[model samples]
Target chain A: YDKWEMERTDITMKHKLGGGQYGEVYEGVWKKYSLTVAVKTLKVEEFLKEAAVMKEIKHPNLVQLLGVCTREPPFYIITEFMTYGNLLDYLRECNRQEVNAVVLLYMATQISSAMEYLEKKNFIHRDLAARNCLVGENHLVKVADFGLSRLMTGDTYTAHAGAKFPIKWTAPESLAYNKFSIKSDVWAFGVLLWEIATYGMSPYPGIDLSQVYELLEKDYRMERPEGCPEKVYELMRACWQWNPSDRPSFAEIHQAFETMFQES
Target chain B: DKWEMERTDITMKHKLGGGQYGEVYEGVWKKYSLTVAVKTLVEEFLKEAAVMKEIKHPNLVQLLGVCTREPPFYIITEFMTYGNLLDYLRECNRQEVNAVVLLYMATQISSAMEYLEKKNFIHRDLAARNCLVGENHLVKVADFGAKFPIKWTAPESLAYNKFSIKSDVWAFGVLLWEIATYGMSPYPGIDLSQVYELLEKDYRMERPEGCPEKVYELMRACWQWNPSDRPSFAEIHQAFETMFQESSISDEVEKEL
Candidate 1:
């Protein structure tokens, strides 16, 4: 296992990349290694535990957890710097005429590969979306945010009271029952595919977030994005199966994408 | 014209609002069973109704059908749930509305106007009251006609009755100020008669409190005296688009009011 812990003095934080009221992200320099990196912060209660989940996992397609300042309060978690930032930003800003479905599908496969790893490790990426993934040079995309991620001890995990769920991307069962499972992650992956298909456009354009659960119960699903391929959209529909068991796994989804990329 | 609707085919429901032309009522098109806003039109509006027939855009209030058979003619449009943009903005002031939401509303209005500008259609009257808010706080430019609100008019348009898309740009600047102040009146306490003289001396309304400097700068660009000097609706739309992306929404701000 890698020695992932580092002293706060070892890193010098600089420009704010983006942030929210609860957590923040910044550009930083890891002086010890002379490496430029992304410094992220989060809730105190989850900061220590979240790093443990990220530190244990390592993949080229997954945002690397370089180091953490877990020894004190006001924690800092450092990771490899992504050049283009989040996938949503890249998709929104990049010239749509230049970036084709082939590139988009490749990015999807890269994320699928990362999620495939999580599937094998019995981890649930509870919050998987276009916004959660990071982008780098040469059209590289890595699954990044693990704030709501969890390691499954059994088939599923029930969230405690007061936990806010991302209703748009969440599985129907997870929203109604507060259940989190690898299959629930599959449900979110479907919405991520829809976001990629729409070039970072939000899921459920006119529908409110509060209406999402009710719509799902009434057998409502988002229509296929314009110019989206028949096969790719079919794959999205497959992942959104109401019965979590009916949804395809990351392994199957990744393989399907690889076949479609060449065909696309 | 094929756009004409039968009087018996429509049933009036609730009253929407009144205008200088006539009153508007929420009605149903019995043929399509669609909810529509039926505006009773004056005879002079016959030509304006013709232009509206062919004009189409997502952000523009669509002209569904018109009852042009007689003097008590009507122009039916797609109904907007939230009603007037000005009233909606004022009501929203009581709640915690995001600055991004105002920018978003401005962006849509600019986009609709940009489409009209591209189509070589000039909106002589452009103001917050002339726009309608649809569901999800979607703002659409409505009412191609309006009173001679010289306060919202460009100096050239006021002096010579020369109205163009550039004049519309000047009015849009006033609308932006209105939006910034949450639908508050622009050039407070200044009479319409004083507008031309004040504008001639290079005077512009001061930026609203808590309004971003960049937005006020765009308003200045739109308020340029010479029509040619004013920024086009396309440029204004692009500016707001960039502004919106930079000012990220703080929370999951789909506040369904």
Candidate 2:
């Protein structure tokens, strides 16, 4: 039901852009559609899995995969270009005073909405940080980066031992065990809220890495980032509960953010 | 085979650093006349002993035996000459070791991880401090018991107390950063308060200045927010191998020049 494959020749790989371990990403033009796109070079093995994942999932708050060029060994995964780059980078670049509560609310809602969709699809995005989120036209933020994502067969993914994870954003249970579910992702969403509040300030600043386990064990969480409203911080606290079941679902979060946005 | 041994067989030497769980001692086994690290723990002595007894690898600090029948239960393992890797790197002050040697150390550590990955065992804690430098600067992975600094720990492990190869991979990345920067702490300026939010936004510590671009790239791969997205220890080993080949060729070209 989902087809997002394209041709290499059809894509005019323009200037070289940023990249990760897989390969370089390029600003490209899909000549046939005359659409500007972000072209990511991926290994053929990775492209197959990611392409399917991308095809099965679609939402306005997700950076849409336009097409794929799989005719060669180094596969090209194409997605709609996000003009403003990633959310964290964008937030850092934006003047803190200019980004009011309404904007933050809007950003949070869009992300939570996408996360809500992901929950419905039985997907666990183990990496849901703001850096994975892309800001498109008109401050529209979309959750991106499925590199560490998984489509779970059940409610939780018993993560394989020795896999790396984002320690700061994870829930206590997921941090202790390798269990991942929508609830764990919700915990991460809470951290994302804090990121939005801080306008890209590092979380848990000055803390030693070795000491974080004990810190969390003591129920020590980050105090609200400066300028973060009491209500938003409350929501973050709710998401950060030790028990995964205690955390609010993305649906709840989305509505709250929506209400916050509507109120302003 | 039973892992227990006579307490008389071992002799504890000078005091090493102590943690909440145990105090490490430089020790010796009378029978083998071998230097060893004996960790005397107050709790979970049996569980850690059992885990260590089942594992054997060159890159892992080999468990010699246990003296649990007596109080002041001891977990014994092969001694490392250079102490903790973090301290070793720190003592170097970034002057002695070059990138090649650092990458080599990373390769050894990854090789150990690959062995663990194949065995389906997660180190849980993989960091410079948790690792020890042995003869010829070999870095062996060590188990430091319950205490884990959040910086080297993966988010899932911190939140859930889950230890997996992925989390180890994450710690490995921070370990790489530590190696590259000559023992600089991960997230140097970032406070504990901001770390969670910072990580939530996919913020990673920048590579230390002297680290080669490829090595730094590998470090980033280790830092992937998702456990599944991280390269396996085996994959990391391959990457190190590739880097070694490239550097060797460059070295040869430099010799010709």
Candidate 3:
């Protein structure tokens, strides 16, 4: 039988995916399960917080924070190890000319499926980007990096100034007043669609980091990346609508992706 | 072209830069009550205006409208709040501007360069001085290069008159150094004319303080002696985007620590 709290010695750190005092993440091994996992080294306080958030949720589309190694000084948050690295890098490496839209849309649909679960649980992933998703075998994508995620007590979570978040990927309402909701995540998913469309191209390409909100207020959205399907681009625009209420729900979005997959 | 503005609507203000051939002015456009940077040129000014008009991307400065009717023909653009990136980096408190911001700036600049690269345009003088800064850590590639920037010029461009996007890539490497060091001059204390010779000897600017090896690696790729060895602007853009995202994750983790 497996347990949430495991011995640190039982886990093996392989290649570094990245970290922080700062925490580092690695391709690691869980000895009991003989499972390869993403061993994310984190501070003790945040470690418990993430574990608490992760305990109740389990889905194939979502990265499983399988167990923890809290019996020692360096704490660990182990997740299902994705072989192909983050979706952002994976998208970048893909040959655009020969890429199949169906596969790429399938990847987006997986993310939407993950977000659908988070949406159902009233969770807000304040940091949702292609970079935060991991790519597994057969173009499978699982959303990860829940450090900035929150389990909302109500419909929204208000963040204070100086809290780090991806401004470009965030919703207009979220960026304007620091309010995050499932809808904000939807806005980000829209941006993720654009990211996938452009082979991991930067969002608001050529737009300044500071001008994002201002431009958004002016109804200026990024042009569709070259070769992106029109129907997919329409979905991105719908996700980016100024009124979050008008945006598609994750369930609907997942279905849409599903529909697109079927159509493809 | 439709980009031409009425001469009477343009008011030239204090000189921003330029020497004999032309001068750039921080001026106002009376037509729309808009603040604009007006560049007066002695060269074929229409050509510059024409080039600017042909392309439009978020990272590159846009041609607002031009007053191209006479001598000191003008090319007007949205006035950059902080002017050139070189000055902003020099005067701003570099300590306050973190690596994420710097990487973000690099990412935006590369995004613009990639646009130009895609269109087969070569920015012969790619450097920190030719870039503009804006509010919210926004940086835009500006002015487009010409007459061969000495220190920023690539080795191949210097010896063979080969001015390609690869050559531009070479200058961008020096620009990256400028950004990392907070506008510190490239090849500090080296003679301007000696750059090609030093570069010929495989001498590149050492990594700046507090600069990550990943960023320095991209810079090295840009500084390759063989033009083909240098990464494309698209490649540079992707690299910066990756670093940009990584910086975000790192900073998010760092904040709690």
Candidate 4:
């Protein structure tokens, strides 16, 4: 591929949104699409890492990569923009809606579908969480943030610091050692479900990521929250399995939710 | 020129996100809302150059471009609206949804891994934060800073030296553990120092909150003291897919309760 040319970063950019790890996301419009987008300026090395990773996988559920400004000293990547911000804010509003077993299934299904696509591609999403899920108009759920991911073929899973993995959302193997896989991602998904159902209540409340692993190893795991429905609880339990093999596939989860929505 | 972004012109906006290694700020590329995730460089860290070069999966995160000029090199990628899988799991874990939804997420990870395998790439960090959720709840793998350590180590490298495909399996095992735990941390009871020691001694932490027995066994295999003993991503993915297929259909559905 020809060398990508750098673009002018001199114009005044609009600051529109922010997140836990990522600081602020600005809204800007590029002449190419003639559309407004979000600009996220991050550490150069880290961005290079993500850019390299993005060049590998190209999924539908994933955000589209328009281009990059690498020819210049300070580089930047252009992607399709989401009008709505992150999942946390979108979830807060979603909580206001009549939350029921059916609605919960709908949300889970969307997430599962995205995951299904990823797994099929042989890419292990080192991180899978709700705050990572972005909401767009019409209740669109988008999974973003590739700051700590790697592409594995045969033997590739290892632990390092550049890509930070949250303890609260990790599996036993992950916290204890560096053991992780599709199953661990499922475990995180279960937690995401809980976050969604609780109307944004912190996962494993009264505890930080460090504490969560202890409670879990001690045979003390997250119980069904007050408002959590029975169905949701069962599903969550299945995801929290300590073993990678025990967790189900995102496709199955999608079908289950589809059925729940259709039947219920 | 419209495409020349200079360091001086590099304007930093309010912080958009922060992780252990770096932070993300809002900035422009060609006067566009080109959200870029600029990651700072840490000395003695691994970079995933070989891993990224071989990947071509759709579900995994896309690396748009990069700038390795100074102390804080940047990895420019597509700006995703969804934050991370952890945030979503925290939210969903509380709700009463069908078990199948969780299963679906597991399958998707497997699928993405499958794609990576096809392209001769291995995903070392298989956790919640690395996966991004997009417009359709699509999941993508992000970050490759640590891949080089494993690559440089060579085939004979043990778990202690550089990472291996088996090590990747180990990470996937942890990802499974994360999915089952519903946002619970792995090895919650031990301190970091102790945790490391125990792990070095061949100790696998507890599984996630409600991980199934079979799944637990699979994760254990990934956590094996000997990396050679671990299963491949395809094997692990197949096992989960089989479990989903063999599982009773009604088990996922809300019965006449």
Candidate 5:
């Protein structure tokens, strides 16, 4: 086991990386990688499924599990740091500037590529969000946060409950039932794209969780935000289709996004 | 809880939002000011661990991480500080009254419910009380304790208590009524049991006065006697889409609302 030591006290635990259900995360660095990393010190058992999932998959957008430590009572999952940080942060920053459609497409392309990469592996990043995405220098987007990533064996496959956060990214079928497929992931990415276009607006900001659930059960769904391109809206609507079988595959998504980006 | 001297490692502080089962504290993560909503479960509720293990939805409250050994189980999520939609709507009052607001509500709820339905889940408690309103008008469906397993008509479906999609639709109708009525309590002036029994009897409540008739019809459809007869979220979204299209509410008015 590598002797765990802070390279220097000067590295300073800049800030907390937010608390999860089990533990909290912090931003720090190792002299070796010269890379920023988020050190997630979580309860041991919580790592069981997530560790297995992360070990099994390999993708560029996915947060790389740089190392894990269990020398003592508390455990840690060290990951490649995302300096620019979450999609929401970037959007907020962009909101203050005069961003354009091409920029939106650029973000969509990065996100879609990451999603496509996951889909190709037959898994779904169930809980994709603006906060999960990291923006590297020069606005390069890397979709991080794999806490909910899991294989989509089939439409009937039962999903792990604790993996996904309930929010606007959910597809109708997934919302109505515990069942989800590649389609649900697609729906989530669609919302992420919408978030990008709107400069960090919540997919449905004004409504509360109760009203959302009631409406969801009643089959209410999202529409393209104002200013979202017509084609983009059409693509987003398709992802929210009720039937999982009806949703377009990741291959289709890549093609469409590519064409959209090129056209833009 | 793991890192000794957490207060030193922690750089930013925030106010915890709201949760029925637990508390939400706003804190930063490495300069990332995260508003995390944590749900704590009492010891006796340990038996409900499986409940935490079986739920999923896009609009449903998500699990960031879980810790049980801390005496009580804590379920945390990225905190959304915009308050609840029910409260927001009430505050907006007539100042934000418009078909677009109505349409926005319609789509937000539909997306969440449909995501659940795909999993064969009936969010047994789909009222305004369970929804979390985030920054911007984003509506996130919360709570999975009331999840209803869709008995896919298989024998195993009957093993546990199951909820029909119709019940969810019924909840949707209640939420629609709640939103349109401007946060009026469901079954107002009626006892809780009476509301349940009446709902079971296929008795539907009338839409609030001054509410648009077209929208009321949609709620009525959701509360139809036969659950199978309830209009799908897709259809509901379509109906509202058409309504918003015809209303011609100016974008300026919609935003100001």
Candidate 6:
């Protein structure tokens, strides 16, 4: 009973949250626990692989799966429901004058910590962003949306052809040669930093998605947002280095945010 | 003298809006043949006028002049055709506005808030309702007074009445959320009575539909429970600048694709 199987009648769908090309997500309630949960429905074939990954990982910053409802035709991966919707909508609706650096730093620290956890697990969150992170009460952010995550035995995983990717967040090496590693994640992390600074604004605002490679090849990087601190901007620049090895580790990024948290 | 306006030269018109301080009116100045916004302040927090006067930024509502000699002192500013951002957003209903335009408005407000943060000033009541939208969809951060929305406020502000940059950051997060969702109420479906308790438990509002992942991350940062952990206004402004450039590039990229 404590295994991967879940009873069909135990879960009830509340409302649809959103969906991607592969799956749909809904707010669900687990009857036994009498608690609200996030239910992710995907094809049965994909659900088996994803559920295997979800079962092994558990961290405070990572979204937790409650149980799997794969016994029936419409498969579901039930997890904890986050009250505050997605990070993007939450930021866009909040008053701009109210946010400060320290609050942002706290969030930055949590994300880096999550990435750090993934790094240690030899897992790469190919797509990591605030949009992928869910907000709970007191603004507790947990990294979610693991559709593209890949587990590797070594430092790198060669890419598969014609795979969907978020162009702006992809690293230079990842785009050039289909090479992905923790360092490639660092490159995406830099872009995520810019997103956090802007509060849900689109990245590479003026650039064409296809031109990301050209700009990166030309050593062109994102400029600091208006009124952004030099220190934080410097950290972001370091993450966008031409060489993947030049980028700092997730642990280092987390450490940096922690230090900033302590000083301020 | 530069900041002073003669009372006889101004003609007060219809009431534009009113808040915790006093009513704001559309006023005409005969001297310059121009229209302006006239805000009457309560005597208790008259110091805000001085702070507003000293600060000057394109993104901040321009303080044209002040008439302190009159019985009900007026703080005059440039007239924004679109009125407040909240009203404009509600009228548009989140659908007409695209991601780039919403971000552009957010960038302007962040730029203004950054200036105030640099000056060590706290906008205790920052919200969508507090921001004014001018010509060309320019957003100006304004309305420094009381009567803050409880939902938009930070925990510290409500709990201890502490108004700091951190508290302001928390409110900014909520405002950004509002912009993404087109003036939707924050913490939708949550009871006002239980909001404090929910916040205390680290619960935040869910992400708005179609909101970018990176933007949501920034909002999450601004909503940190510990004020000291929030990012500074300068950092937020920089982020917006980066976003503007990125958004433009992406537009071009899509066209090319």
Docking class of 6: incorrect
Q: What shift in Å separates residue A139 of candidate 2 from its native position after superposition?
A: 42
Candidate 6 lDDT over B144-197, as tens digits, reads 444547898899887888889889999999999999888988988878878888
The best candidate in terms of lDDT:
1
Q: Kindly list the per-residue Cα lDDT of model 2 for residues B110-185, writing each as its tens digit.
A: 8889889989997876788788887767889887755658788787776678778899899899888988888888
What are the TM values for chain B, all candidates? 0.89, 0.89, 0.91, 0.69, 0.70, 0.92
* Residue A32 in candidate 5, Cα distance off native in Å: 1.8
Compared with the true structure, model 2 gives a TM-score of 0.48
**Steric clash pairs (candidate 3):** A19-A23, A19-A24, A20-A23
Score each candidate by Cα lDDT. Answer: 0.78, 0.75, 0.76, 0.60, 0.60, 0.77
- Please provide, for model 4 over A1-264, each residue's C-alpha lDDT reduced to its tens digit, 9 standing for 90 to 100: 234333655223546444323443455555332344555555367677766666665544466565566775445665656544567656676535444455556557667877877788777776787767765433445677734223222211333344445667788888767787888888888989888887666677776454666688777778888877777788888888767688888777766776666766
Per-candidate TM-scores read: 0.49, 0.48, 0.51, 0.45, 0.43, 0.51
DockQ of each: 0.01, 0.01, 0.01, 0.01, 0.01, 0.01
Q: What is the interface RMSD of each candidate, in Å?
A: 16.0, 20.7, 15.5, 16.5, 20.5, 17.7
The interface RMSD for candidate 2 is 20.7
Model 1: docking quality category: incorrect
Q: List where candidate 3 sits over 4 angstroms from the true fold.
A: A1-264, B17-22, B41-43, B144-148
Error of 4 at B152 (Å): 68
Candidate 2 lDDT over residue span A1-264, tens digit each:
235666568878776655442136788766544345777775255557887788888777777778887755677778876655678878888744445777777778778988999998999887788778876433467788845334223312333346555667667777777788899899888888888888887667787556666897889998988778899999999988888898988888877876776567
Candidate 4 per-residue C-alpha lDDT over B1-257 given as tens digits, one digit per residue, 9 for 90 to 100: 22213444344555555543256554444456565554334433225422344465667776554555554554445666867776677776345423455665776687787666656666655677567667655667675332333211222233355555766766777777677766566666655445445666766666554455556778788777666777666666655554453232224222321
Q: What's the residue-level lDDT of B5 in candidate 6?
A: 70
**TM-score of the first chain of model 1:** 0.86
Q: What is the TM-score of chain A alone in each candidate?
A: 0.86, 0.89, 0.87, 0.79, 0.78, 0.88
Of the two candidates 2 and 4, the one with more favorable TM-score, higher being better, is 2
* Candidate 6 ranges with C-alpha deviation above 4 Å: A1-264, B17-22, B93-96, B144-148, B255-257
